[PDB]
């Protein structure tokens, strides 16, 4: 019967910066015992199972470095990270063990960084795929920041606006960059009716697009 409210939903600071986030419970989490409010903080990185950082409001878990600091009492709790590192990218959850359990909504930590431009690559379909009536052209836009980027496909110079499927990576825990994949999918027979294929990346870092192309005949 206890509900949990984390804020903010999302959060962005540069490496070296201090950050804090808030967790409130609909009822007090302190039964007695000097301290021991029943409140714990977990860190969940992309594609990983959660990790316990702090329990009893303020007690750091074994092997957790001291730059993570929990504080507060009753129905108001805080997690602080001093000297943020790119490795800290995660969703941060508070959980309440007073009665049963309730996880707060979570706070996403996004790192702020220095703009950088994408390294673009283009790949023509494989012999195998053109072997099953399928032709996927794949364009990688790697290690860029910020996360805004627009991709434009061209077939013999004509912009193509369907069969296009885009996917962004998690922000990288080592250099705080993003990468993206764009896949243009056609039938083999449709692929074989054109020669030049092009992906054009428009990113804040240059007002002139980065162009990569190949020719079927190439």
């Amino acid at each position: 019967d206890i509900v949990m409210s984390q804020s903010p939903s999302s959060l962005a600071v540069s490496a070296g910066e201090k950050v804090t986030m808030s967790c409130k419970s609909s009822q007090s989490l302190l039964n007695s015992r000097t301290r021991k409010n029943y409140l714990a903080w977990y860190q969940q990185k992309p594609g990983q199972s959660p990790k316990l950082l702090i329990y009893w409001a303020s007690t750091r878990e074994s092997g957790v470095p001291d730059r993570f600091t929990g504080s507060g009492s009753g129905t108001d709790f805080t997690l602080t990270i001093s000297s943020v590192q790119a490795e800290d990218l995660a969703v941060y959850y508070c959980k309440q063990s007073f009665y049963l359990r309730t996880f707060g909504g979570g706070t996403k930590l996004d790192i702020k960084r220095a703009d950088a431009a994408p390294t673009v690559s283009i790949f023509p379909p494989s012999s195998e795929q053109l072997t099953s009536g399928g032709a996927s052209v794949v364009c990688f836009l790697n290690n860029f920041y910020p996360k805004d980027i627009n991709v434009r496909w061209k077939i013999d110079g004509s912009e193509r606006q369907n069969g296009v499927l885009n996917s962004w990576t998690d922000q990288d825990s080592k250099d705080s960059t993003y990468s993206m994949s764009s896949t243009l999918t056609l039938t083999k027979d449709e692929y074989e009716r054109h020669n030049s294929y092009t992906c054009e990346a428009t990113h804040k870092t240059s007002t002139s697009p980065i162009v990569k192309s190949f020719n079927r005949n190439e």
Binding site: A40, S49, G106, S181
Partner: protein, 220 residues
């Protein structure tokens, strides 16, 4: 070592029951409660219920009463959770965790989670394709290769490079759904002087079909 071992990704049909395990090792099974946690892809952690194998008492999040049933087999040091009459809304990752019963009330060791995908649909293995350059080049100090993983169901698949021994340079993209089939790709970047002279292979695993593909990336 303290360790919680869960079953692999599963596809189940709507309306069926699915029972999943969490095999404990490295600690006193009857001294710690086991908690179960649900996570829809890209959404938050949601507590389902807990059990204390010593007594077998169960406590539940109201929302999961009439849906989840928690059991523990002391003889095998295994806890189980069971979802009944499943729907697409039960598609999620489900974790077990050892919620310490040493007075520090927290879960300090977690399972790797079991992905459950409730659909009627046929579980399809994916085709892996090599992504090698077209016979053109630039920024030659480094070279980028990839794997295309297309036409599988359900999630997830695992992509590694040279059995994890190629670690640096790797981006694996979130899967996206096309007409009831998933598709993702992985990129890897190496010294222009190491390829093709030394081998580069992506290793794709699709647990739901028990498929393991190794695609060597060969030039042209």
């Amino acid at each position: 070592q303290v360790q919680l071992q869960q079953s692999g990704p599963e596809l189940v049909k709507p309306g069926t029951s699915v029972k999943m395990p969490c095999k404990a090792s490295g600690y006193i099974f009857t001294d710690y409660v086991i908690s179960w946690v649900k996570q829809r892809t890209g959404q938050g952690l949601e507590w389902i219920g807990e059990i204390f194998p010593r007594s077998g008492s169960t406590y539940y999040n109201e929302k999961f009463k009439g849906k989840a049933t928690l059991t523990a087999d002391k003889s095998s040091n295994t806890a189980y959770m069971q979802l009944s009459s499943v729907t697409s809304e039960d598609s999620a990752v489900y974790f077990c965790a050892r919620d310490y019963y040493g007075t520090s009330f927290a879960m300090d060791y977690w399972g790797q989670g079991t992905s459950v995908t409730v659909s009627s649909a046929k579980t399809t293995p994916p085709s892996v394709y090599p992504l090698a350059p077209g016979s053109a080049a630039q920024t030659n100090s480094m070279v980028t290769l990839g794997c295309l993983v297309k036409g599988y169901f359900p999630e997830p698949v695992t992509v590694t490079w040279n059995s994890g021994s190629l670690s640096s340079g790797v981006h694996t993209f979130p899967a996206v759904l096309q007409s009831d089939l998933y598709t993702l790709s992985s990129s890897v970047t190496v010294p222009s002087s190491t390829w093709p002279s030394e081998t580069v292979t992506c290793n794709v695993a699709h647990p739901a079909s028990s498929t393991k593909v190794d695609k060597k990336i060969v030039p042209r």
